[PDB]
């Protein structure tokens, strides 16, 4: 209905959306792995298990 | 200190007072700025030569370099000011207040 192009089209910018979602999932995976390694390392240093 | 050290510091004080007290011209204040730079160069050179700090012998030269920049900067501004008013009077730099 717009009289102009309205560069943002009906479909989203799939490249940017994919990049955003990929960055989020990569960050979450890295955080989970880092927390696991931190817990194991602390348990090793203090000799709990 | 000897008499030379106090003489150089007195010259620096005189140049600082001369800059801080404006009369009419911006060029006179720029000249006072260069006078302060010259006094600083002389004092630093005397201190470095007296104590035989070999690697510090290059510091005054570096000082001079940046002095030139300051001078050039000031002159640039002066030109623009004159182009606005036809004079280099500091009385015309009063569009902004506190």
């Amino acid at each position: 209905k717009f009289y102009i192009r309205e560069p943002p089209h009906g479909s989203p910018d799939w490249l940017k959306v994919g990049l955003t979602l990929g960055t989020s999932v990569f960050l979450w995976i890295y955080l989970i792995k880092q927390h696991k390694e931190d817990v194991l390392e602390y348990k090793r240093r203090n000799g709990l298990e | 200190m000897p008499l030379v050290y106090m003489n150089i510091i007195m010259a620096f004080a005189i140049a600082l007072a001369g800059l801080l007290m404006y009369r009419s011209h911006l060029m006179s204040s720029l000249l006072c700025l260069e006078g302060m730079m010259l006094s600083l160069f002389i004092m630093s050179t005397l201190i470095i030569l007296n104590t035989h700090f070999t690697l510090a012998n290059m510091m005054p030269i570096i000082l001079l370099v940046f002095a030139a920049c300051e001078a050039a900067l000031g002159l640039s501004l002066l030109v623009m000011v004159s182009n606005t008013y036809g004079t280099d009077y500091v009385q015309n730099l009063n569009l902004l207040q506190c």
Binding site: - | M1, Y5, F12, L16, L19, L20, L26, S29, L33, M36, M37, L40, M43, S44, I47, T51, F53, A56, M59, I62, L63, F66, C69, E70, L73, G74, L77, M80, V81, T84, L93, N94, L95, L96, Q97, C98
Partner: protein, 347 residues
């Protein structure tokens, strides 16, 4: 001005600041100040008009005098002890010269007269740069030489800065001058706690920088440089004026907003030494800054001023350039107090 040239000048300003911040030699710190000033002068004159030229001239004169006094202090210190390292400043006269020169560079009272004039004479972007980035280097040097400071001189200048900032800002209808006076008062607050704890100085500087960035970005978003210009914004973008009001509330120092965190901590620190009277006076004086922030909030957000007819056309268009860091800056400037203990990561 070319975009490439503008980028190069901004990078040179930043590089001068980092050269001051990473150096161990007094000559290199002075060189960083020199390079920063040389690159900063054209940034103030980016949009050419007589007012910008006058502001640049005043800024240059002030900073050149301050740099010359800085060099004199360094030379005297070298004379009385052949030391070039930035350290406990073995001579008291050189230390007084250094304190006065750095105060002139920072805009601390009574070397404050240039700040409102320069801020008023330049654009909002240059004012943002001057009031945020140009504080880092002198404050870093002051933090480094804090052990040999004379508490009387800096405490006098800090109290004068707070008083003069409040009183001067009380009289302003121009937004840039209001920002300049707020900057003077916050400079006083940051320098008051320097002889006691540099971590508090860093925390206060960070919070002030965040708040100032958010304020200036909101002032750029709605093209207002006066009170009456800002009084039209509600008829175009009400969310902007609402966020502006909450930001002004935070800058006023009211709990539970983040602007309360620095002063609070600073007061606490000053009571760990004896120092009871000075924090009380500082808070009572900061009430003035709160007052003129509240007056601005009255004018822009809490009441609706009359508008013009042509505003209707502005309803049909949108903001093209969008600042990406504005929402994060607003959130950090308002909702950060519960994370106060994280300041331990600063030391």
């Amino acid at each position: 001005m070319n975009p490439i040239i503008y980028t190069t000048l901004i990078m040179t300003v930043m590089s001068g600041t980092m050269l001051v911040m990473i150096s161990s030699h007094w000559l290199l710190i002075w060189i960083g100040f020199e390079m920063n000033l040389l690159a900063m002068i054209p940034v103030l004159m980016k949009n050419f008009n007589p007012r910008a030229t006058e502001a640049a001239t005043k800024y240059f004169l002030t900073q050149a005098t301050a740099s010359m006094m800085l060099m004199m202090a360094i030379i005297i210190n070298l004379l009385y002890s052949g030391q070039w390292t930035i350290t406990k400043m073995f001579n008291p006269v050189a230390m007084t010269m250094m304190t006065m020169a750095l105060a002139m560079k920072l805009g601390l009272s009574p070397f404050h007269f240039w700040v409102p004039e320069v801020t008023q004479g330049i654009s909002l972007q240059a004012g943002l740069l001057l009031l945020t980035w140009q504080k880092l280097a002198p404050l870093s040097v002051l933090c480094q030489i804090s052990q040999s400071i004379n508490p009387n001189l800096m405490l006098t200048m800090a109290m004068l800065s707070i008083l003069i900032g409040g009183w001067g800002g009380l009289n302003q209808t121009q937004l840039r001058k209001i920002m300049a006076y707020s900057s003077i008062a916050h400079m006083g607050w940051m320098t008051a706690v320097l002889p006691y704890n540099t971590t508090m100085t860093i925390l206060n500087l960070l919070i002030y920088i965040t708040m100032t960035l958010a304020m200036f970005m909101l002032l750029i978003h709605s093209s207002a440089t006066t009170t009456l210009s800002l009084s039209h914004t509600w008829n175009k973008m009400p969310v902007i004026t609402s966020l502006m009001m909450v930001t002004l509330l935070s800058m006023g120092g009211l709990p539970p907003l983040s602007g309360f965190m620095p002063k609070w901590m600073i007061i606490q620190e000053m009571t760990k030494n004896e120092s009871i009277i000075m924090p009380t006076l500082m808070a009572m004086t900061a009430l003035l800054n709160l007052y003129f922030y509240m007056r601005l909030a009255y004018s822009s957000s809490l009441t609706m001023f009359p508008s013009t007819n042509n505003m209707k056309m502005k309803w049909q268009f949108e903001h093209t350039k969008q600042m990406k860091l504005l929402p994060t800056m607003i959130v950090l400037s308002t909702l950060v107090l519960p994370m106060t203990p994280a300041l331990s990561s600063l030391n």
